[PDB]
């Protein structure tokens, strides 16, 4: 039978699905460790690999990318889980290796690929402590080209009074996503700062794993695809909305939680955001 992960329900995605809004024709790039295209609960439309030693974007030797992708778009059928936007056209942009790391050049190459390939939504469940002029340029260009760019805020917790949001999430053009649990409490690991935008479920998230498996993972990497998936639902209902509109809508209709330094604008509500 199919199971609906708590997180999907929490952001109110099923309300949209019931209406017939499921992300059809929206192109979402998962920039990560690849996607196992052999998984019966996923449908990969395309993609590219920028990892010099791992040239097939459709082999995920890590598991991270497959898991993120399932959150965005696990198919609505009689098996496994259900994604936020089950009808989305999913692209595997492999910029991380088997070990879950990757060079900035690889990551940037992936963003440039996504712009050139007309992705509607980019999901970056990754980050580093330092930025670069090239990293900023690429995210800025994507936004200027009308792409919705979403990224995990980071898993650095709190540190005195400073921001622990990593890059590229830290850049204003990118939506920075922090993690909450099923009770709406901020996860202890969730990065904090004035650059945090919104929260989404990120603790014990059940999704797809390579080799026709399913398992839970925790992290802001798990939170981000709920927002990428949400953007895809909005776009399926309002195809003419610009990325700016999508973003404002998501931020403006959240369920307010605690202070913005810890929760940003609050928990997204795709139902409210979709008007
Ligand atoms: Ca399924």
Q: Is 259 a catalytic residue?
A: no
> Cα(3) to centroid of ligand 1, in Å?
7
Identify the active-site residue in 87, 221, 224, 249: 221
Count how many Cα atoms sit within 13 Å of the Cα of residue 233 in the half-sphere of its side chain: 35
CATH of 1-275 among 3.40.50.200, 3.30.70.980, 1.10.3720.10, 3.40.50.720: 3.40.50.200
> Cα(233) to centroid of ligand 1, in Å?
17
Identify the active-site residue in 17, 32, 33, 89: 32
Identify the active-site residue in 36, 39, 41, 64: 64
According to DSSP, the β-strands at 205-209 and 213-217 are: antiparallel
Sheet of 148-152, strand order = 44-49, 89-94, 27-32, 121-124, 148-152, 175-180, 198-201
Task: Tell me the domain boundaries of the chain.
Answer: 1-275
- Token couple for 238: 């309002």
User: What secondary structure letter does DSSP report for 167?
Assistant: B
Q: Which residues contact 166 (CB under 8 A, 6 or more apart)?
A: 127, 128, 129, 153, 154, 156, 191
Q: What are phi and psi of 8, to 5 degrees?
A: -65, -45
According to DSSP, the β-strands at 148-152 and 175-180 are: parallel
CA distances from 120 to 1, 138, 207, 240 (A): 31, 15, 23, 12
CA distances from 67 to 20, 134, 165, 261 (A): 24, 28, 22, 28
> Cα(81) to centroid of ligand 1, in Å?
4
Rounded to 10 degrees, the C-alpha dihedral 257/263/269/274 comes to: 130
CB 92 within 8 A of CB 35: yes
> Cα(70) to centroid of ligand 1, in Å?
9
> Cα(189) to centroid of ligand 1, in Å?
29
> Cα(250) to centroid of ligand 1, in Å?
26
N-to-C CA span, the chain = 31
Structure resolution in Å? 1.7
Give the method used. Answer: X-ray
Q: CA 145 to CA 199: how far, in whole Å?
A: 25
Closest C-alpha to 52, from 130, 110, 91, 137: 110
């Amino acid at each position: 039978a199919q199971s609906v992960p708590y997180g999907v329900s929490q952001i109110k995605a099923p309300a949209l699905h019931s209406q017939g809004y499921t992300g059809s024709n929206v192109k979402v790039a998962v920039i990560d460790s690849g996607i196992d295209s052999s998984h019966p609960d996923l449908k990969v439309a395309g993609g590219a690999s920028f990892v010099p030693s791992e040239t097939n974007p459709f082999q995920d030797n890590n598991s991270h990318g497959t898991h993120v992708a399932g959150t965005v778009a696990a198919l609505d059928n009689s098996i496994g889980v259900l994604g936020v936007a089950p009808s989305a056209s999913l692209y595997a942009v492999k910029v991380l290796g088997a070990d879950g790391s990757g060079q900035y050049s690889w990551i940037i190459n992936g963003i440039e690929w996504a712009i050139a390939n007309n992705m509607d939504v980019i999901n970056m469940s990754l980050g580093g402590p330092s930025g670069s002029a090239a990293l900023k340029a690429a995210v800025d260009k994507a936004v200027a080209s009308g792409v919705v760019v979403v990224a995990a805020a980071g898993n650095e917790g709190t540190s005195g009074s400073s921001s622990t949001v990593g890059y590229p999430a830290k850049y204003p053009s990118v939506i920075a996503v922090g993690a909450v649990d099923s009770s709406n409490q901020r996860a202890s690991f969730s990065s904090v700062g004035p650059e945090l935008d919104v929260m989404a479920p990120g603790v014990s998230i059940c999704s797809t794993l390579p080799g026709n498996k399913y398992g839970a993972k925790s992290g802001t990497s798990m939170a981000s695809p709920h927002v990428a998936g949400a953007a895809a639902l909005i776009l399926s209902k309002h195809p003419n909305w610009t990325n700016t509109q999508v973003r404002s809508s998501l931020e403006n209709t959240t369920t307010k939680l605690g202070d913005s330094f810890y929760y940003g604008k609050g928990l997204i509500n795709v139902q409210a955001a979709a008007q």
